[PDB]
Ligand binder design. Sequence first.
Ligand SMILES: [Zn+2]
Ligand SMILES: [Zn+2]
Ligand SMILES: [Zn+2]
Length: 178
Amino acid sequence: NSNICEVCNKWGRLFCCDTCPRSFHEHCHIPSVEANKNPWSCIFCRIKTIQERCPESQSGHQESEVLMRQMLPEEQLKCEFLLLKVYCDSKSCFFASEPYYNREGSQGPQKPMWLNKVKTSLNEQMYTRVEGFVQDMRLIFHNHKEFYREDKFTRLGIQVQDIFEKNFRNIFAIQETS
Ligand SMILES: [Zn+2]
Ligand SMILES: [Zn+2]
Ligand SMILES: [Zn+2]
């Protein structure tokens, strides 16, 4: 197995996947690495299994249909993995914890949002459809773009949103377009 966490790229107390060479910190994995379970398969392996069980699941989909799906177990897993892929980018640090807003010439957002809040919301089964999760994710970046206005720091929101959106298109097999 790898000797660094797949998500944060640090050593420490690592849990190893039995079906692939990835490793994880307990709370870096989503869901948090399960207490017992031997063998244990990580989220990357669990997603790969879904695909192998239903090869047609990789055919193209419309975003509108994906968003209206109910959060049954497979969709719950896919949103967990998508959240995880965002945390895998080091620029996620900026969006992880609860933000505060005090900048001359800007007003904070009406509905603040952050990764750890989405993480808790998924854990507590608060989203009933994929749309709920995707709306909160996109709101993170939209709030940032609006608040930072012309400061070059706005680019961090663009960058992390692009990671989100590429991974959304991949994980949910969104039909490719120009
Ligand atoms: Zn980690
Ligand atoms: Zn694995
Ligand atoms: Zn099938």
